[PDB]
Structure 1
Amino acid sequence: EVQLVESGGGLVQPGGSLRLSCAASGFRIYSYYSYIGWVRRAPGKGEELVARIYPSSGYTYYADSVKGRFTISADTSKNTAYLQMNSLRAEDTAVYYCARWDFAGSSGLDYWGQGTLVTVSS
Structure 2
Amino acid sequence: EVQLVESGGGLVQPGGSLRLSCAASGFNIKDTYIHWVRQAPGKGLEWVARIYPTNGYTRYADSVKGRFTISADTSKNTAYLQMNSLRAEDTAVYYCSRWGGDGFYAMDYWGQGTLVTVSS
TM-score (norm 1): 0.93
Number of residue pairs aligned between Structure 1 and Structure 2: 120
Structure 2 unaligned blocks of 5 or more: none
Query: Is structure 2 residue 50 aligned with structure 1 residue 52?
Result: yes
The alignment's TM-score, normalised by the length of structure 2, stands at: 0.94
For residues 25-44 of structure 1, what are the structure 2 equivalents within 5 Å? 25-30=25-30, 32=31, 34-44=32-42
Between the aligned residues of both structures, percent identity stands at 84
CA distance in 2, matches of 1:105, 1:13: 41
Task: Report the Cα distance in structure 1 between the residues aligned to 2:13 and 2:72, rounded to whole angstroms.
Answer: 24
Deviation of 1:105 after TM superposition, in Å, equals 3.6
Q: Deviations over 1:19-67 (max 9, x none)?
A: 100100111111x2x1112110012210000111112122001111111
How do 1:19-98 and structure 2 match up within 5 A?
A: 19-30=19-30, 32=31, 34-98=32-96
Q: State the match for 2:118 in structure 1.
A: 120
Deviation of 1:74 after TM superposition, in Å, equals: 0.8
> Counting strand residues as a fraction of each chain, which structure ranks higher?
2
Q: Could you tell me which runs of 5 or more consecutive residues in structure 1 were left unpaired when the two chains were aligned.
A: none
Structure 2 SS opposite 1:91 = helix
Q: Which runs of 4+ in 1 moved over 2 A?
A: 102-106
